[PDB]
Amino acid sequence: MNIFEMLRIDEGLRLKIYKDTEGYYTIGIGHLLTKSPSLNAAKSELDKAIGRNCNGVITKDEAEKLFNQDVDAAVRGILRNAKLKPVYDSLDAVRGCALINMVFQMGETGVAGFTNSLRMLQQKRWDEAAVNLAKSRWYNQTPNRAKRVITTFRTGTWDAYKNL
């Protein structure tokens, strides 16, 4: 299992513009197009991202291309962030994926705000971090996903993604 497989499970794959859990226009593997309610705006964003007139639909290869760019951006966001980098460097490879998963979903800024959980992760207090992470809007709005991620941080194994 790796970060790509993990996010593919959490985000799924859709080749036509759809709305994410928050009601935002998205496509491919969780690639947010815009927070604007305008489908037209979303369509334009899509064409700009892909480099052709898509009319709202893309190929699997295109979805995969966007996906690689998105994972790259998440990782780079972590590496550039002063609060994130030290935690990320302190974690084993599996747990690191859980952190990348969060950034992909909520953005660098969003995750950097989880101050207390970040400190607990850096201290390797797994059970305590898990409880703290669960006291969030994040956990309450997307509980199944949050549970998989939190379990990953808690155990350092891929168990939560096994049998999916």
Length of the chain as a residue count: 164
* Phi and psi, residue 26, nearest 5°: -140, 165
Q: Which is nearer to Cl ion, 86 or 143 (CB)?
A: 143
Q: Which is nearer to Cl ion, 145 or 154 (CB)?
A: 145
Residue of 10, 11, 45, 108 marked active site: 11
Asked if residue 60 binds Cl ion (CB under 5 A), the reply is: no
Radius of gyration over every alpha carbon of the chain, rounded to an integer in angstroms? 16
Q: Which is nearer to Cl ion, 122 or 142 (CB)?
A: 142
Task: Give the tokens for residue 36.
Answer: 């604007």
- Return the residue of 145, 153, 154, 160 that touches Cl ion, per CB under 5 A: 145
Residues within window 61-90 making contact with Cl ion, judged by CB under 5 A: none
3-state secondary structure of 53: coil
Which helix (H) or strand (E) segment is 10 a member of?
A: helix 3-11
Question: So which residues are the catalytic ones?
Answer: 11, 20
- Contact footprint for Cl ion (CB under 5 A): 135, 142, 144-145
